[PDB]
Design a protein around this ligand. Sequence first.
Ligand SMILES: *[C@@H]1O[C@H](CO[C@@H]2O[C@@H](C)[C@@H](O)[C@@H](O)[C@@H]2O)[C@@H](O[C@@H]2O[C@H](CO)[C@@H](O[C@@H]3O[C@H](CO)[C@@H](O)[C@H](O)[C@@H]3O)[C@H](O)[C@H]2NC(C)=O)[C@H](O)[C@H]1NC(C)=O
Ligand SMILES: *[C@@H]1O[C@H](CO)[C@@H](O[C@@H]2O[C@H](CO)[C@@H](O)[C@H](O)[C@H]2NC(C)=O)[C@H](O)[C@H]1NC(C)=O
Ligand SMILES: *[C@@H]1O[C@H](CO[C@@H]2O[C@@H](C)[C@@H](O)[C@@H](O)[C@@H]2O)[C@@H](O)[C@H](O)[C@H]1NC(C)=O
Ligand SMILES: [Cl-]
Ligand SMILES: [Zn+2]
Length: 603
Amino acid sequence: LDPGLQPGQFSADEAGAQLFAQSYQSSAEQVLFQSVAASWAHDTNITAENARRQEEAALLSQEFAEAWGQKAKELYEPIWQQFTDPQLRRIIGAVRTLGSANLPLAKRQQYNALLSQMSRIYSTAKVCLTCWSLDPDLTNILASSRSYAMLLFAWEGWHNAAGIPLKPLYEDFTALSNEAYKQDGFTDTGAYWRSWYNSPTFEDDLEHLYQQLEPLYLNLHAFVRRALHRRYGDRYINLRGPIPAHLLGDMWAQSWENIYDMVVPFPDKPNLDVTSTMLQQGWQATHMFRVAEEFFTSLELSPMPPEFWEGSMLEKPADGREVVCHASAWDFYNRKDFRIKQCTRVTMDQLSTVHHEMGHIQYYLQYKDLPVSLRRGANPGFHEAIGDVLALSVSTPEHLHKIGLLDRVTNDTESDINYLLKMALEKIAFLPFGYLVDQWRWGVFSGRTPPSRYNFDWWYLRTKYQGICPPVTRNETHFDAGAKFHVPNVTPYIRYFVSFVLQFQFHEALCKEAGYEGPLHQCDIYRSTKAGAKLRKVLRAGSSRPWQEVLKDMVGLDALDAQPLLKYFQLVTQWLQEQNQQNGEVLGWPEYQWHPPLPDNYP
Ligand SMILES: *[C@@H]1O[C@H](CO[C@@H]2O[C@@H](C)[C@@H](O)[C@@H](O)[C@@H]2O)[C@@H](O[C@@H]2O[C@H](CO)[C@@H](O[C@@H]3O[C@H](CO)[C@@H](O)[C@H](O)[C@@H]3O)[C@H](O)[C@H]2NC(C)=O)[C@H](O)[C@H]1NC(C)=O
Ligand SMILES: *[C@@H]1O[C@H](CO)[C@@H](O[C@@H]2O[C@H](CO)[C@@H](O)[C@H](O)[C@H]2NC(C)=O)[C@H](O)[C@H]1NC(C)=O
Ligand SMILES: *[C@@H]1O[C@H](CO[C@@H]2O[C@@H](C)[C@@H](O)[C@@H](O)[C@@H]2O)[C@@H](O)[C@H](O)[C@H]1NC(C)=O
Ligand SMILES: [Cl-]
Ligand SMILES: [Zn+2]
């Protein structure tokens, strides 16, 4: 480690730790900058040379972590917990967590290499027969093909190409991750991930939330299953069984907005998917980013700086290079450079994704003056929810009309049902998947799920919560969990279930604060400077204070709460129950063993 980057001496006491943290921050900024730079160069341009570089950068960050980790222990182990300065306790708490820096050098190299290799496999896998990539090729197939056979070919090819080669790597990564975190005193990596919520009853709190949400999901599911039965017929849809996993519009069946045209109850009303209008008008990526920016400035939040426009990657490259297409937002830790990398396509759900990623940027802009350790969300769920909250105003029919995407606007109960059903396909359908992914991964890290049951345990959970089934037989050579971005890219998942709850609590608070006084689902906070100010107080806090207190100041409660999401959806909740009753549906999937047959000509 460079001499300039190494820790000095400080006293064993709180005045020293202040000097320590100032010294640390001053060093960490440079280390973070070089890591993030090398990751960027790789993620926008996957080459062996770029992976080697990113690995050398992660090694540097491990030596940094070890030297300051060990120094923070050596001087402050007995005293840090008792500091007067609350922010200074969280700073030291972060600095003393070693992670992968607990590994000896040889295993640090093996760990850094596994991260590179898993990311490469996921982002460069192809389905051939002349080869399709996930984004945009397979995405487009899953979204707009209605051919059982075609959709099967894409689903199977993807799962096979991405998952099978990842399995041995995934195994070796799990063992090394556990070895690293167990020397920080956690039972396993999953215990370390969970500890970010600082909540003794987290697992029980999530389960209580899920029990209140499950009836809405079960009713959406049955109604959608019926729509599918009418197109695909009795051979491929079982009205008492799980839904084939390839028929819901999306490679992971995790949100259903693309099959809106099959389920829309009142087709004579304004057409609420505005994608075709966007195309007709000639919208491009950069217009989408500008319209999103304008919503933020209407709240008196910050514009995107020059460095964001000059540095970002807003389309998939044409020049041949290979890239990580899954979207992400980048803080370089120098308080100057911030970027988005997104393979943006011109579609309405992609306009939402634009807002999602710009919400992360806005968080980085607001907290850029805190000590580097506090430059995070109050919890991870808060960071994921910011952009989603604004996207809830943007997609209201009235807002779409203001921005030239919807010609007529109607205010009547049929238009409301359409609206709430479209939003349910996006928000309600997701809930079971958002909850299950880390139940799977926590079982793997704890050893409850060894490599010999990775796929068995994955499909148990897929069926149990989502009520889907794989459309072809799977076995333990398949590794279907690894065909989802966040698994090989090692991004925790429970943050999204938390986010999907929190965003409705935020929405309700900012609508009240804006002075809005009609139905929660018709609220648009656009141009409300009072709403902007309340949002800004959250963003400016970073992780400097407990999330339960940040939440209470914002919404008036110190806990996650399903009530706002339930109030938003109330009208469609009631309507879907009534429809399913009148149609004699069976809620749930009692025929749990059922799978569809192969088509005659497969493949
Ligand atoms: C779309 O329409 C709804 C429904 O509006 C009501 O019903 C219609 C059949 C007609 O009778 C309307 O003339 C009538 O308002 C609109 O929601 C309603 O908005 C008003 C405010 O604009 C709400 O009234 C307020 O009530 C609070 C206390 O709750 C008072 O302090 C205020 O002074 C104010 O009068 C009314 O409750 C609300 N109805 C609800 C909640 O269902 C809706 O705003 C409109 N949407 C759009 C986008 O225009
Ligand atoms: C993608 O990454 C490679 C490095 O892996 C970049 O290639 C280097 O390009 C510079 C300038 O053209 C040369 O001096 C080097 O010799 C190249 N290295 C090689 C080929 O090993 C490439 O330019 C990157 N593409 C971008 C940034 O668009
Ligand atoms: C696992 O499955 C592999 C791929 O074949 C698939 O499984 C058969 C049984 C069909 O029903 C269909 O889904 C696919 O063709 C096999 O090649 C492999 O041998 C299977 N078993 C093991 C232990 O890997
Ligand atoms: Cl998380
Ligand atoms: Zn995100």
